[model samples]
Target: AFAGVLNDADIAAALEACKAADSFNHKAFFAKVGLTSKSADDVKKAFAIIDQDKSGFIEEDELKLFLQNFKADARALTDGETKTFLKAGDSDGDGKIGVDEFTALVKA
Candidate 1:
């Protein structure tokens, strides 16, 4: 019943667009992915999937391959891109993003 919400292509487009921009827009990107419309449970679903290594957090390595979690062959984020991304949600300055941090980010 929630089938109309799939925005994988939109997510990919936003990611591609960010690479061409001066800075990555986390809010805009999350909105484009339809996460703004998703519930906390859904956001958590996203966190688990994107966490990749099941580490309960998203590290730089997982962050670099972030897009791939949404699309199998998606391009990996560059070091600079990954660094900016990590900082956006790594609110605790732990060099990684925890579930609450990710949820706050997606729902922010």
Candidate 2:
């Protein structure tokens, strides 16, 4: 589970660090880290970037295009996992994801 990825204490400490830094954006926080989004554009633009083909929807191939940019091993992602993440994040089920769903999934 994701909880195992970072224990409660670690998550708490990270939250505290973020609060202490006070430099984080209260709005469009993901944008401060180079992700994109607009109040009007839903699923966030950062998530949209994952759809490199600009197909207005993300397919498995689009995911491959997105992950290919990584310098690390690409095998870190599995097809099933990619589909799972997309399905879990694509709230509208339009076979495409939007800023609202992406932001909600990532909690940014």
Candidate 3:
């Protein structure tokens, strides 16, 4: 998923969507893509791990830590990359990633 700034509402929405999407059917979709499917609670746990600050939102720095700990690719993740990624995820262009935007990124 793209790195981006997110407000509390946005984060809440994203979390809700994740919970909704966390289902056996959804897991089947991931399996179709050759990925293992995680339960809703598992997804929430992952997000919680990333949201170390427990601020109800995931910021760029927190995302960086999440990626680093998970061994996710960090290349092309400079300030410019952050700005680009955030812009893409911030659908309303309010300098924040809303739930819909984050969900799209995750499901994309």
> Which candidate leads in TM-score?
1
Please give the CA lDDT of all the candidate structures.
0.78, 0.47, 0.44
TM-score of every model versus the real structure? 0.82, 0.46, 0.45
Which portions of model 1 miss their true places by more than 4 Å? 1-5, 19-23
Tell me how far the alpha carbon of residue 85 in candidate 1 is from the true structure, in angstroms, after superposition.
Answer: 1.1
User: Candidate 3 — which residues are off by over 4 angstroms?
Assistant: 1-41, 72-76, 98-100
Clashes of each: 0, 6, 0
Backbone clash pairs for candidate 2 read 42-98, 42-99, 43-98, 43-99, 43-100, 44-99
Q: Model 1, poorest ten-residue lDDT window?
A: 1-10
Per-residue lDDT of 23-68 in model 3, one digit per residue for the tens? 2132232334222343444445555655667765557765434333
Give the TM-score comparing model 2 with the true structure, all chains together: 0.46
Question: Sorted on TM-score, highest at the top, how do the candidates line up?
Answer: 1, 2, 3
- In model 3, pairs of residues that clash are none
